[PDB]
Structure formats: C-alpha cells, structure tokens
Amino acid sequence: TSGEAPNQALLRILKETEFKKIKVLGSGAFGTVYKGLWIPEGEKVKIPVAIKELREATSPKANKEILDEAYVMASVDNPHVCRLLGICLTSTVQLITQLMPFGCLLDYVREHKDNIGSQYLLNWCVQIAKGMNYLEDRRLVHRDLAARNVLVKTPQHVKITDFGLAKLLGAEEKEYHAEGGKVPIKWMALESILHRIYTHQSDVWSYGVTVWELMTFGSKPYDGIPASEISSILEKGERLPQPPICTIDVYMIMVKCWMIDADSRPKFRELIIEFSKMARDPQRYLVIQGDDMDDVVDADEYLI
C-alpha cells in the first residue's frame, strides 16, 4: 500500500430480532439512545447495550453522518474507547454499542461530587489519556473530546465515545481542515478556532478543558461568555481558572495543554505518565474535603 494500512475491522449487521429496547436513555433532534438487551441467536448470552437510532431515515445527510460514526466506532479496540458492536438496518439506522450504565462522566461528577475523591479524579485522567493516546496511535483526531463524551462503565472504568466529528489523518497528513458545522468552541484549540486546523495536539487542548470539567465537578467553561468572544479572550492570554481542589502541580499540567504553540503542549503518552504518578499519591495533588440476569455477559467479555 502506497500510504496507509488496510482497515480490516468487521462491520456486524445485527438482526432486529436479536435485541430488545428497554428504556429511552435520551432523545435528541436527530434521534434517540435506548438501553436494551442484545441476544445473539445461537449464543446463550444477553448483552446490555445502548441503541442509538436516527429519528427518521428521511435525511440522507444524517444517514451519511451516522454511518461515518459507525465506521470509526467499528475500527477502534481499546479498554478506554467505546467500540461498535454492530449496526441494525431496519427502517431507521441503529448503532448498537456496549451499555455504559453510569452514563456520561459530566453528569456523574455533577451528581456525585460529594463522594468523589482524588483517587477517582486522577484515575479518570489517566484512563482518558490512555484512550486518546490509543486514538493517536490509530492516527485518529477526535475533535470532540469533552466530559460529556466520556462514558462511565463503572466508577473505576471510563471510556471515550462520540466519534461524530472524528477524522482519520493520512500517513502524509498532520492536520485536518474542516468547513462549517457547529463545533464545540469552548473546548477547541485556538488554531482550530482561527484556522479550523485539528491535530492530536489540538485534541490535547480539549483534554485540558476536560480535566478542568472534572476538577470543577462539572463546571461550564467560560460560563456566561459568548462563544464568539472566545477567540479574542484566548489570544489576549486568558485561560480557565485554577480549580479550588487543584494543586499547582495539576493546574500546571492543564495550562500546558493550552499553550499557543501546539507542539509544546504535552503528548497524551506524557499525560499518562504524569497523572499516573499523581494517582499514586492522590491527596498530594488534589485537596478535597472528606477524602432473568443469569446469562448476562458484559460486552467486554463477549468477543467474536
């Protein structure tokens, strides 16, 4: 191959018979996420799943985006990345993925802030750095890393999801150039705002904002600031403030992800090392007051 490696991920087409929706987890304008049970026919297993369905197939552009997402989700495999189990084509395109029962990490930290200690926070930081580093290996720029897009399998185990903006860099490319469409401005590197240039180092900036979300127990970045005003305030030198529980050691890691020169920001592989060292003595780096279901198989244990 004159360039990249053949993507031999498998795309599993699942029968609608094989799974049963249980509850709505959430509805948007473009569709709904359900929780359900998948039961591969020949297997004596029931697998808890989230089922993400496009509301109405009457939007070829939409069907094209959700299939782009499924391509990406089908091609990743890492303990800290959400992988696609299969798709269902019935009338509405449905993505089937492993159910992450505690939901997204942003709502988790807001709901349980009075019971979240430094060990958890720094461990999450390690696990997200691991997921992102693995995506960097796969030459994949996420473009929407945020605490809303980290899911909670258990309080000890989180994974990166929402690959709807993710782009695959080529072997001869280093940057992605996008063209319109709503983008999460308050998580975007300055180069992404100004020139719509995206890089793994652009993702590192987003990682900085995501850590800041966690350390503030789900605070909104630049709360009350118009998204249009963000470009200018970031040029002037302004950054997110030091969260109360953060030592200078941790806040300085966050600030380095927000260096204007993108190459002098940390590598995800370095963020793994630094937070892992910190997670080894958590109270030195965060200061927090008070520190039939018989055939059910989690998806991480169903491997075909």
Ligand X SMILES: COc1cc2ncnc3c2cc1OCCOCCOCCOc1ccc(Cl)cc1N3
Give catalytic residue positions. 144
Residues 197 to 236 in contact with ligand X, rule: CB under 6 A: none
Distance in Å, CB of 132 to ligand X, minimum: 16
**CA-to-CA dists, residue 142 to 1, 198, 246, angstroms:** 25, 9, 26
218 is an annotated ligand-binding site residue: no
Q: Which of 47, 74, 87, 99 binds ligand X (CB under 6 A)?
A: 99
Q: Does 75 bind ligand X (CB under 6 A)?
A: no
Q: What's the token pair of residue 196? A: 């719509």
Q: Which of 37, 50, 190, 254 binds ligand X (CB under 6 A)?
A: 50
Sign of the alpha-carbon torsion through 187, 281, 151, 170: positive
| Residue 206 neighbours by CB under 8 Å, 6+ apart | 142, 144, 145, 146, 184, 187, 188, 189
Q: Does 144 bind ligand X (CB under 6 A)?
A: no
52 is an annotated ligand-binding site residue: yes
Contact 113, 166 (CB under 8 A): no
Q: How would you classify the pairing of strands 167-168 and 140-141?
A: antiparallel
Residues 162 to 191 in contact with ligand X, rule: CB under 6 A: 162
Q: Does 25 bind ligand X (CB under 6 A)?
A: yes
Taking CB under 6 A as the binding criterion, the range among 93-101, 117-125, 271-279, 280-288 that sits at the site for ligand X is 93-101
**Cα–Cα nearest to 204, from 247, 142, 120, 150:** 142
| Residue 245 neighbours by CB under 8 Å, 6+ apart | 118, 215, 286, 287, 288
d(CA 76, CA 129): 15
* Contact string 106-135 vs ligand X (x = CB under 6 A): ------------------------------
d(CA 114, CA 52): 31
| Residue 51 neighbours by CB under 8 Å, 6+ apart | 19, 21, 33, 34, 35, 36, 88, 94, 95, 96
162 is an annotated ligand-binding site residue: yes
Q: Does 33 bind ligand X (CB under 6 A)?
A: yes
Q: Does 52 bind ligand X (CB under 6 A)?
A: yes
Taking CB under 6 A as the binding criterion, the range among 146-154, 185-193, 198-206, 252-260 that sits at the site for ligand X is 146-154
Q: Does 97 bind ligand X (CB under 6 A)?
A: yes
Residue ranges of the annotated binding site for ATP are 25-33, 52, 97-98, 162
Residue ranges of the annotated binding site are 25-33, 52, 97-98, 162
| Residues engaged in binding ligand X (CB under 6 A) | 25-26, 33, 50, 52, 95, 97, 99-101, 103-104, 148-149, 151, 161-162
